Amino acid sequence: ATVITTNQTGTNNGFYYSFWTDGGGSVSMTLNSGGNYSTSWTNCGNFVAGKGWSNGGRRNVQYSGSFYPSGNGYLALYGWTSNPLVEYYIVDNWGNYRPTGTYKGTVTSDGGTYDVYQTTRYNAPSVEGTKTFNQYWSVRQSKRTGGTITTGNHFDAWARYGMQLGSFSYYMILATEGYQSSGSSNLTVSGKLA
Ligand SMILES: [Cl-]
Ligand SMILES: [Cl-]
Ligand SMILES: [Cl-]
Ligand SMILES: [Cl-]
Ligand SMILES: [Cl-]
Ligand SMILES: [Cl-]
Ligand SMILES: [Cl-]
């Protein structure tokens, strides 16, 4: 096991990982065997941490484990693109706050119905430092922790709705995210290109 408490990216037991925090409260990630990682957070500001891949792409992600937010947290397949710069989310679980923006329609994937949203952040933290970028959201209509996310279904449906992804230059991870909250996650990821 390797405990992570500081903004870094890395590799661990075959998997890319990523941890980001704005410094608030107490936040840790523990990297275990294969696809497994745990997080623990107490009164965070904002953090994102997970395991996956150095590069996004159309794969079938399998994951399992537990996700217990007290207040605002997300469980999401998460990453970035360049040219253009996009932060993207496929959200399977959340706490008291459901992500929302400009509604674009639905996509059905992996046994669920996902609402598609677009929002924008101005002069915000990014993989390319302080930047302005669009966020693409798929948000399941019902909470679950575990199953397959077929990324191709989400990418194809965003594309049909005017949401163009750039290049998969950046990581794609199964993320735990927290805003002004506390909780834990314990998640195992694997997957493969479709
Ligand atoms: Cl909850
Ligand atoms: Cl709307
Ligand atoms: Cl659903
Ligand atoms: Cl639900
Ligand atoms: Cl759950
Ligand atoms: Cl599934
Ligand atoms: Cl809290």
mmCIF file of C-alpha atoms and ligand atoms in Angstrom:
data_model
loop_
_atom_site.group_PDB
_atom_site.id
_atom_site.type_symbol
_atom_site.label_atom_id
_atom_site.label_comp_id
_atom_site.label_asym_id
_atom_site.label_seq_id
_atom_site.Cartn_x
_atom_site.Cartn_y
_atom_site.Cartn_z
ATOM 1 C CA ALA A 1 0.000 0.000 0.000
ATOM 2 C CA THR A 2 1.138 3.591 -0.825
ATOM 3 C CA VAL A 3 -0.675 6.518 0.941
ATOM 4 C CA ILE A 4 -1.017 9.674 -1.264
ATOM 5 C CA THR A 5 -1.802 13.097 0.315
ATOM 6 C CA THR A 6 -0.214 15.513 -2.238
ATOM 7 C CA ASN A 7 -1.129 16.590 -5.776
ATOM 8 C CA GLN A 8 0.593 14.053 -8.042
ATOM 9 C CA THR A 9 0.024 11.671 -10.974
ATOM 10 C CA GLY A 10 1.882 8.311 -11.175
ATOM 11 C CA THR A 11 1.673 4.567 -11.912
ATOM 12 C CA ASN A 12 0.822 1.874 -9.342
ATOM 13 C CA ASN A 13 0.530 -1.903 -9.999
ATOM 14 C CA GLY A 14 -0.190 -1.418 -13.760
ATOM 15 C CA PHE A 15 -2.612 1.596 -13.368
ATOM 16 C CA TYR A 16 -2.235 5.351 -13.908
ATOM 17 C CA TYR A 17 -3.334 7.316 -10.865
ATOM 18 C CA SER A 18 -4.164 10.926 -10.137
ATOM 19 C CA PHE A 19 -4.742 12.885 -6.904
ATOM 20 C CA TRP A 20 -5.729 16.574 -6.756
ATOM 21 C CA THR A 21 -6.883 18.646 -3.703
ATOM 22 C CA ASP A 22 -7.231 22.477 -3.156
ATOM 23 C CA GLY A 23 -5.766 21.905 0.403
ATOM 24 C CA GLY A 24 -9.025 21.916 2.497
ATOM 25 C CA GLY A 25 -9.558 19.658 5.574
ATOM 26 C CA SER A 26 -7.989 16.124 5.505
ATOM 27 C CA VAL A 27 -7.938 14.009 2.296
ATOM 28 C CA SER A 28 -6.020 10.814 1.556
ATOM 29 C CA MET A 29 -5.901 8.109 -1.135
ATOM 30 C CA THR A 30 -4.475 4.613 -0.511
ATOM 31 C CA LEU A 31 -3.235 2.720 -3.615
ATOM 32 C CA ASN A 32 -3.475 -1.151 -3.147
ATOM 33 C CA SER A 33 -3.045 -4.180 -5.529
ATOM 34 C CA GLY A 34 -4.129 -4.115 -9.193
ATOM 35 C CA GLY A 35 -7.058 -1.720 -9.866
ATOM 36 C CA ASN A 36 -7.830 -1.019 -6.140
ATOM 37 C CA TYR A 37 -7.704 2.379 -4.367
ATOM 38 C CA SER A 38 -9.426 3.735 -1.232
ATOM 39 C CA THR A 39 -10.036 7.375 -0.250
ATOM 40 C CA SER A 40 -10.946 8.944 3.126
ATOM 41 C CA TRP A 41 -11.862 12.655 3.439
ATOM 42 C CA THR A 42 -12.935 14.926 6.400
ATOM 43 C CA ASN A 43 -14.402 18.438 5.757
ATOM 44 C CA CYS A 44 -12.627 18.794 2.338
ATOM 45 C CA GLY A 45 -12.635 21.859 0.137
ATOM 46 C CA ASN A 46 -12.432 20.111 -3.258
ATOM 47 C CA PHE A 47 -10.536 16.934 -4.322
ATOM 48 C CA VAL A 48 -10.474 14.395 -7.220
ATOM 49 C CA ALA A 49 -8.556 11.097 -6.964
ATOM 50 C CA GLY A 50 -8.652 7.751 -8.783
ATOM 51 C CA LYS A 51 -6.993 4.937 -10.770
ATOM 52 C CA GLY A 52 -7.294 4.306 -14.509
ATOM 53 C CA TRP A 53 -5.279 4.993 -17.700
ATOM 54 C CA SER A 54 -2.656 7.598 -18.762
ATOM 55 C CA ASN A 55 -4.849 8.173 -21.862
ATOM 56 C CA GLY A 56 -8.636 8.199 -22.424
ATOM 57 C CA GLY A 57 -10.162 6.158 -25.237
ATOM 58 C CA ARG A 58 -13.205 4.013 -26.010
ATOM 59 C CA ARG A 59 -12.946 1.205 -23.449
ATOM 60 C CA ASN A 60 -15.402 -0.881 -21.405
ATOM 61 C CA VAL A 61 -14.564 0.020 -17.764
ATOM 62 C CA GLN A 62 -15.482 -2.568 -15.069
ATOM 63 C CA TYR A 63 -15.459 -1.358 -11.469
ATOM 64 C CA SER A 64 -16.807 -2.407 -8.040
ATOM 65 C CA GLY A 65 -16.431 -1.424 -4.351
ATOM 66 C CA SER A 66 -18.090 1.139 -2.022
ATOM 67 C CA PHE A 67 -18.713 4.976 -2.169
ATOM 68 C CA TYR A 68 -20.106 6.632 0.990
ATOM 69 C CA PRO A 69 -20.351 10.430 0.818
ATOM 70 C CA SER A 70 -21.705 12.576 3.719
ATOM 71 C CA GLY A 71 -22.783 15.593 1.680
ATOM 72 C CA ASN A 72 -21.449 16.364 -1.789
ATOM 73 C CA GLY A 73 -19.350 13.683 -3.548
ATOM 74 C CA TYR A 74 -19.223 12.141 -7.062
ATOM 75 C CA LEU A 75 -18.327 8.701 -8.392
ATOM 76 C CA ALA A 76 -17.388 9.155 -12.073
ATOM 77 C CA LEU A 77 -15.313 7.869 -14.964
ATOM 78 C CA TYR A 78 -13.353 11.121 -15.412
ATOM 79 C CA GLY A 79 -10.721 12.641 -17.671
ATOM 80 C CA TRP A 80 -9.560 15.385 -20.029
ATOM 81 C CA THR A 81 -9.020 16.110 -23.751
ATOM 82 C CA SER A 82 -6.898 18.802 -25.535
ATOM 83 C CA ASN A 83 -7.642 20.789 -28.736
ATOM 84 C CA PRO A 84 -10.150 21.293 -27.433
ATOM 85 C CA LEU A 85 -9.663 21.307 -23.642
ATOM 86 C CA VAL A 86 -12.620 19.371 -22.063
ATOM 87 C CA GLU A 87 -13.109 17.855 -18.541
ATOM 88 C CA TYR A 88 -15.644 14.965 -18.889
ATOM 89 C CA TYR A 89 -17.690 13.011 -16.350
ATOM 90 C CA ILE A 90 -19.735 9.804 -16.493
ATOM 91 C CA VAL A 91 -21.374 9.951 -13.042
ATOM 92 C CA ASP A 92 -22.812 6.685 -11.564
ATOM 93 C CA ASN A 93 -23.259 8.026 -7.912
ATOM 94 C CA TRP A 94 -23.452 11.312 -5.928
ATOM 95 C CA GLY A 95 -24.586 12.543 -2.447
ATOM 96 C CA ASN A 96 -26.931 15.445 -1.732
ATOM 97 C CA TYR A 97 -25.951 17.362 -4.971
ATOM 98 C CA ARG A 98 -26.823 16.101 -8.448
ATOM 99 C CA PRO A 99 -24.703 17.704 -11.194
ATOM 100 C CA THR A 100 -26.738 19.764 -13.686
ATOM 101 C CA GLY A 101 -26.345 22.308 -16.506
ATOM 102 C CA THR A 102 -27.741 22.826 -20.018
ATOM 103 C CA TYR A 103 -29.713 19.546 -20.676
ATOM 104 C CA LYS A 104 -28.864 17.913 -24.058
ATOM 105 C CA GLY A 105 -31.028 14.727 -23.984
ATOM 106 C CA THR A 106 -30.351 11.142 -22.735
ATOM 107 C CA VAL A 107 -28.149 8.103 -23.567
ATOM 108 C CA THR A 108 -28.952 4.544 -22.306
ATOM 109 C CA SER A 109 -25.821 2.610 -21.198
ATOM 110 C CA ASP A 110 -24.957 -0.369 -18.989
ATOM 111 C CA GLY A 111 -28.487 -0.968 -17.676
ATOM 112 C CA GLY A 112 -29.241 2.711 -16.900
ATOM 113 C CA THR A 113 -30.494 5.983 -18.416
ATOM 114 C CA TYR A 114 -27.998 8.893 -18.312
ATOM 115 C CA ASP A 115 -28.909 12.609 -18.525
ATOM 116 C CA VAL A 116 -26.405 14.622 -20.617
ATOM 117 C CA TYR A 117 -25.353 18.142 -19.486
ATOM 118 C CA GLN A 118 -22.864 20.840 -20.556
ATOM 119 C CA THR A 119 -21.444 23.588 -18.270
ATOM 120 C CA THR A 120 -18.351 25.882 -18.452
ATOM 121 C CA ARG A 121 -15.594 26.807 -15.872
ATOM 122 C CA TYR A 122 -13.669 30.158 -16.196
ATOM 123 C CA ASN A 123 -9.979 30.438 -15.120
ATOM 124 C CA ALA A 124 -10.142 27.147 -13.129
ATOM 125 C CA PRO A 125 -7.549 24.457 -12.147
ATOM 126 C CA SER A 126 -6.900 22.077 -15.102
ATOM 127 C CA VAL A 127 -4.339 19.462 -16.323
ATOM 128 C CA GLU A 128 -2.850 22.487 -18.353
ATOM 129 C CA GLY A 129 -2.870 24.914 -15.297
ATOM 130 C CA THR A 130 -5.416 27.768 -14.837
ATOM 131 C CA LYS A 131 -7.795 27.496 -17.832
ATOM 132 C CA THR A 132 -11.240 28.127 -19.367
ATOM 133 C CA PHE A 133 -13.032 24.932 -20.559
ATOM 134 C CA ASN A 134 -16.379 23.151 -21.140
ATOM 135 C CA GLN A 135 -17.426 20.177 -18.961
ATOM 136 C CA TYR A 136 -19.329 17.247 -20.506
ATOM 137 C CA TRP A 137 -21.601 15.278 -18.077
ATOM 138 C CA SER A 138 -23.403 11.918 -18.307
ATOM 139 C CA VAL A 139 -25.331 11.515 -14.980
ATOM 140 C CA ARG A 140 -27.114 8.165 -14.339
ATOM 141 C CA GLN A 141 -30.821 8.619 -13.381
ATOM 142 C CA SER A 142 -30.217 6.274 -10.405
ATOM 143 C CA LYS A 143 -27.303 5.852 -7.983
ATOM 144 C CA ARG A 144 -25.152 2.652 -8.064
ATOM 145 C CA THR A 145 -21.552 1.821 -7.020
ATOM 146 C CA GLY A 146 -20.381 -0.855 -9.535
ATOM 147 C CA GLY A 147 -20.834 -2.281 -13.058
ATOM 148 C CA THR A 148 -19.551 -1.547 -16.576
ATOM 149 C CA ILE A 149 -19.283 1.950 -18.023
ATOM 150 C CA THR A 150 -19.207 1.715 -21.889
ATOM 151 C CA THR A 151 -17.384 5.023 -22.638
ATOM 152 C CA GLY A 152 -18.151 4.777 -26.391
ATOM 153 C CA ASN A 153 -21.935 5.121 -25.678
ATOM 154 C CA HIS A 154 -21.282 8.433 -23.760
ATOM 155 C CA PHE A 155 -18.745 9.789 -26.343
ATOM 156 C CA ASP A 156 -21.134 8.903 -29.260
ATOM 157 C CA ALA A 157 -24.151 10.552 -27.589
ATOM 158 C CA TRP A 158 -22.154 13.718 -26.631
ATOM 159 C CA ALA A 159 -21.034 13.907 -30.317
ATOM 160 C CA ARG A 160 -24.737 13.549 -31.513
ATOM 161 C CA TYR A 161 -25.586 16.459 -29.155
ATOM 162 C CA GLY A 162 -22.857 18.932 -30.359
ATOM 163 C CA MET A 163 -20.302 18.075 -27.676
ATOM 164 C CA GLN A 164 -17.032 17.335 -29.534
ATOM 165 C CA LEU A 165 -14.225 15.679 -27.547
ATOM 166 C CA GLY A 166 -10.607 16.697 -28.415
ATOM 167 C CA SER A 167 -7.630 14.312 -28.273
ATOM 168 C CA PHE A 168 -7.194 11.704 -25.483
ATOM 169 C CA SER A 169 -3.810 13.280 -24.421
ATOM 170 C CA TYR A 170 -4.678 13.052 -20.726
ATOM 171 C CA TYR A 171 -5.709 10.472 -18.151
ATOM 172 C CA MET A 172 -9.080 8.693 -17.830
ATOM 173 C CA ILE A 173 -9.725 7.495 -14.229
ATOM 174 C CA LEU A 174 -12.433 6.003 -12.044
ATOM 175 C CA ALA A 175 -12.677 9.018 -9.727
ATOM 176 C CA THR A 176 -13.826 9.811 -6.181
ATOM 177 C CA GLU A 177 -14.599 13.629 -5.954
ATOM 178 C CA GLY A 178 -15.615 15.693 -2.902
ATOM 179 C CA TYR A 179 -16.905 19.263 -2.273
ATOM 180 C CA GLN A 180 -17.165 20.681 1.301
ATOM 181 C CA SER A 181 -18.028 17.166 2.599
ATOM 182 C CA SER A 182 -16.616 13.980 4.296
ATOM 183 C CA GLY A 183 -16.678 10.268 3.301
ATOM 184 C CA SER A 184 -14.737 7.240 2.018
ATOM 185 C CA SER A 185 -14.493 5.173 -1.186
ATOM 186 C CA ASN A 186 -12.977 1.735 -1.799
ATOM 187 C CA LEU A 187 -13.038 0.951 -5.518
ATOM 188 C CA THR A 188 -11.438 -1.554 -7.900
ATOM 189 C CA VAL A 189 -11.155 -0.662 -11.624
ATOM 190 C CA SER A 190 -10.157 -2.757 -14.698
ATOM 191 C CA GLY A 191 -11.243 -2.584 -18.359
ATOM 192 C CA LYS A 192 -10.226 -2.941 -22.037
ATOM 193 C CA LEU A 193 -10.440 -1.068 -25.451
ATOM 194 C CA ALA A 194 -13.727 -1.802 -27.444
HETATM 195 CL CL CL B 1 -25.519 9.649 -0.479
HETATM 196 CL CL CL B 2 -31.417 23.078 -19.623
HETATM 197 CL CL CL B 3 -31.117 4.576 -14.453
HETATM 198 CL CL CL B 4 -31.201 6.031 -6.837
HETATM 199 CL CL CL B 5 -23.733 2.974 -3.114
HETATM 200 CL CL CL B 6 -23.445 -2.804 -15.949
HETATM 201 CL CL CL B 7 -18.199 17.621 6.232
#
